Amino acid sequence: CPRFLKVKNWETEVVLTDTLHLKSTLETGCTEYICMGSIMHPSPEDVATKDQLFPLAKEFIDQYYSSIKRFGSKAHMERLEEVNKEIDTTSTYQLKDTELIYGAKHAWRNASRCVGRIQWSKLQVFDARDCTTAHGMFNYICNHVKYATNKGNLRSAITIFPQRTDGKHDFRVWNSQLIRYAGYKQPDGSTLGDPANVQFTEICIQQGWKPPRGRFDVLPLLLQANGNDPELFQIPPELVLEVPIRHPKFEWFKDLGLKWYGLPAVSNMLLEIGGLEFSACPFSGWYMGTEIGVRDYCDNSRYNILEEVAKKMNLDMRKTSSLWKDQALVEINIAVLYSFQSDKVTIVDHHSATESFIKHMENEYRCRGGCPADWVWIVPPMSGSITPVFHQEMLNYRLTPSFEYQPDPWNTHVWK
């Protein structure tokens, strides 16, 4: 690979120079002859051997001690030796609290699909590696939700549960996000609530959940500790902050009966630090408006409200070239931003978020030598080219520490 790669911004002519890609550790899926950049998941029961672990841990320890300006120091060399001995006698090792916090923040810093990374160094890390049971995981998650929600002044946070050992004792949050609404398939084929969550909702009902069978039922937590069968818990409703959606101009918009939860909290990803694997690491931030207003509400396979809103706006819905869909989509995103700001719940519009991200990316290029970014994910799902990231060339590559996808736990779990 060449040492310097240039990216251009075609609106501002600004050229940036990337050297950080030389530290790339994993494959992207692309080859010299094919690009897989719009494949969502490009290409087990298998843990790192001693020989796989030694270099992965050294690389991370080296990076950590470089970051604290102690590279080559006595503490650096001693930490290397202690880690090496630990791997040698136990085939794994335990991170220091300092190292865990650094690794978590850097997995966020390295997350190429995240437009909100200007915040990466302001992350509250909750060390839950002493957890042994699902009830304990419930306690940790509740504290996380309460801390991160903060009565609407949201704060980013991650709670990290014990790392993988042999792969038969995994900690998992079976929920894909901590807070989501149930979906219910009807006999007649229609769906009530969130159609994306019909499968998981069915799992919870089989596990014992009594469903309200409404349009916005918060799902219970399904929590697996130490490889045991998962267990159900209801999140105390006073910890689930929600925003009813109204429109500043259209008095009828509240009559739609829409609301959404304030806290986006991903709970199905895997956090990889120095070759260690944290299979339960729920992390949360605050929303960009389009995540709710474009995808959650207007995806055809989700709540799918464009028609109903277009009807109440009295739009001509016979020709697509009237752009009735586009007009309604804007008003829905105006309502979402307006309802969150009125209730003083942190949210960020896609103009402000992408402008912030360009500033972040430029700083990272200057101070770090690059900033991996996935353009397909960074550009918002509406009004793409009137945001600055549309015009920004990006380079995508995989740095470690990192958040990874992992198989859904109901597909792998060995029921006791």
Per the annotation, binding residues are: 38, 114, 177, 286-287, 291, 376-377, 390, 405
Q: How far apart, in whole angstroms, are the C-alpha atoms of residue 267 and residue 283? A: 7
Residue 192 near residue 173 (C-beta atoms within 8 A): no
Residue 375 near residue 396 (C-beta atoms within 8 A): yes
Q: Which of 57, 160, 269, 288 contacts ligand KPJ by CB under 6 A?
A: 288
Using CA atoms, how far residue 71 sits from 74, 85, 209, in Å, is 9, 20, 52
The CB-of-352 to ligand KPJ minimum distance in angstroms stands at: 13
- Rule CB under 5 A: say whether 375 interacts with Zn ion: no
Question: What is the DSSP-derived secondary structure letter of residue 142?
Answer: H
Q: Considering 231, 272, 277, 291, which one is annotated as catalytic?
A: 291
Please state the residue numbers annotated as binding site for L-arginine.
Answer: 177, 286-287, 291
The dihedral through the CA atoms of 381, 383, 389, 395 has a sign that is: positive
Q: Which of residues 315-344 bind its own copies (CB under 8 A)?
A: 320-323, 325-327, 329-330, 333-334, 337-338, 341
By DSSP bridging, strand 124-127 and strand 157-160 are parallel
Q: Which of 118, 205, 235, 266 contacts ligand KPJ by CB under 6 A?
A: 266
The CB-of-393 to ligand H4B minimum distance in angstroms stands at: 4
The CB-of-94 to ligand KPJ minimum distance in angstroms stands at: 26
Q: Which does 180 bind (CB under 5 to 8 A by kind): ligand KPJ, ligand HEM, Zn ion, none?
A: ligand KPJ
Q: Considering 120, 209, 286, 324, which one is annotated as catalytic?
A: 286
Query: Which CB, 112 or 163, lies closer to its own copies?
Result: 112
Selection from 4, 13, 15 nearest residue 361 by Cα = 15
Q: Which of 64, 93, 377, 403 contacts ligand H4B by CB under 6 A?
A: 377
Query: Which CB, 90 or 385, lies closer to ligand HEM?
Result: 385
- Rule CB under 6 A: say whether 374 interacts with ligand KPJ: no
Q: Which does 82 bind (CB under 5 to 8 A by kind): ligand HEM, its own copies, ligand H4B, none?
A: none
Residue 333 near residue 306 (C-beta atoms within 8 A): no
Segment holding 259, helix H or strand E: strand 259-261
Residue 268 near residue 176 (C-beta atoms within 8 A): yes
Footprint of ligand HEM on this chain (CB under 6 A)? 108, 111, 113-116, 119, 123, 156, 158, 283, 285-286, 288, 291, 348, 353, 377, 403
Q: How many residues does the chain have?
A: 416
Q: If you write DSSP's letter for every residue of 317-372 in order, what string do you get?
A: -S-GGG-HHHHHHHHHHHHHHHHHHHTT--EE-HHHHHHHHHHHHHHHHHHHS---
- Rule CB under 6 A: say whether 368 interacts with ligand H4B: no
Q: How many CA atoms lie within 13 A of 88 on its CB side?
A: 6
Residues that bind ligand KPJ (CB under 6 A): 116, 177, 180, 264, 266, 283-285, 287-288, 291
Q: Which chain residues interact with Zn ion by CB under 5 A?
A: 30, 35, 37
Residues with catalytic roles: 114, 117, 286, 291
